[PDB]
């Protein structure tokens with residue numbers, strides 16, 4: 001099963017000769033949990049995520065973003081070490097289905113902490129499973 | 141015809157593996173004879189066909205002369221005093237590295253010099269150059 | 274007969290490499306067919322040893338083997354695959370397609 | 378049978394190269410004899426294209442030719458010669474002798 005985002009990145013950089021990827025290696029990571037959607041007060045719906053990230057230490061992470069599937073809310077992402085806020089922003093309307101969130105600084109610290117299965121939580125005030133994209137450039 | 145100096149440096153750096161030439165490329169150039177040696181203070185001129193590639197860097201260049209004297213050598217442009225020194229050793233060297241550095245820009249050209257000694261074994265020029273490609 | 278850039282289209286489904294290589298289905302890698310005969314031309318990027326080996330085989334074919342028509346420069350291509358089960362896209366997978374042939 | 382460093386001593390007087398090469402009289406350039414068959418060993422420094430070509434020749438020998446045993450790394454040697462009539466000594470005449478063989 002090929003992620004649609006990874007298939008789009010292949011075709012885009014081949015068709016459009018004006019742009020090239022920010023990094024040579026673009027890796028796609030998948031979520032582990034697939035059965036959680038707790039709801040709480042004020043419409044504050046939350047759900048956790050988990051990823052098996054193994055980025056070689058001899059590479060430099062140029063960019064890393066989290067892709068989330070939606071249908072006017074404030075999407076704030078956390079990291080379970082009791083929760084570490086990574087990035088928080090706002091979404092507009094129910095028309096756009098996907099969204100990206102920069103987590104480059106988080107993956108850079110995980111490269112020093114070593115390869116580990118990290119867990120995150122998202123708070124919104126075959127399926128479209130969220131995935132993680134890592135742009136890393138080799139130094140060898 | 142192999143110059144004795146070029147054969148000696150080959151055997152030296154082949155026998156002794158502790159030392160290497162100052163430059164990879166070592167070229168030998170020969171003088172043009174004019175059978176003249178006025179005496180008074182003996183002087184005699186020399187001429188060389190030097191063609192050093194511009195894509196190389198001249199690390200060092202010395203002139204080998206066959207012989208107390210006051211050897212002062214010149215270069216015919218007026219006359220340009222190259223080096224002056226002090227002097228029975230049979231051969232002797234005099235650094236002309238800066239002279240070849242200007243000749244490297246001038247292109248392949250037949251340069252002429254003059255040697256003044258105040259007081260076969262043909263004098264030759266040795267050029268140590270390292271490639272940049 | 275001559276050391277040239279003979280075309281050679283490739284398909285990963287024929288070699289079962291569809292397991293890890295997601296895309297593309299194939300590409301034009303080319304190949305370097307022909308033979309290297311002395312004298313060797315400068316447009317074939319020969320080596321100092323290849324020039325000597327061709328002369329020695331000319332004198333005695335049993336003394337030394339022939340020079341060979343092999344790729345000298347290899348261009349990269351963008352591929353999408355799984356590296357240890359991880360969907361990886363490499364815009365520059367170097368060493369795949371041939372751009373220059375020669376003798377060694 | 379294997380792409381290996383088979384010995385190959387050379388003498389310039391046999392090829393008439395004593396005209397310009399003053400010294401040495403000869404040297405051990407070695408050679409890379411053998412053949413390259415899939416799977417290619419890591420001791421032969423293969424390439425991404427060389428691995429694919431071996432798979433295609435294994436499947437269909439008519440589709441693509443086989444990989445070749447050619448020198449991959451060439452060490453220098455000190456020589457004394459005439460470069461356009463100029464006595465030149467090159468302490469490192471690169472590309473003369475083979476130190477590592479492989480497939481391409």
Ligand SMILES: *[C@@H]1O[C@H](CO)[C@@H](O)[C@H](O)[C@H]1NC(C)=O
Nearest residue numbers: 052053054116117357358359
């Ligand atoms: C997933 O993570 C574990 C350690 O938590 C690791 O041993 C395993 O290799 C990872 N999965 C893959 C496909 O590498």
Ligand SMILES: *[C@@H]1O[C@H](CO)[C@@H](O)[C@H](O)[C@H]1NC(C)=O
Nearest residue numbers: 189190191248249250461462
């Ligand atoms: C001497 O220098 C001239 C410069 O014009 C050059 O053409 C000629 O080839 C040189 N002599 C030799 C023997 O190379």
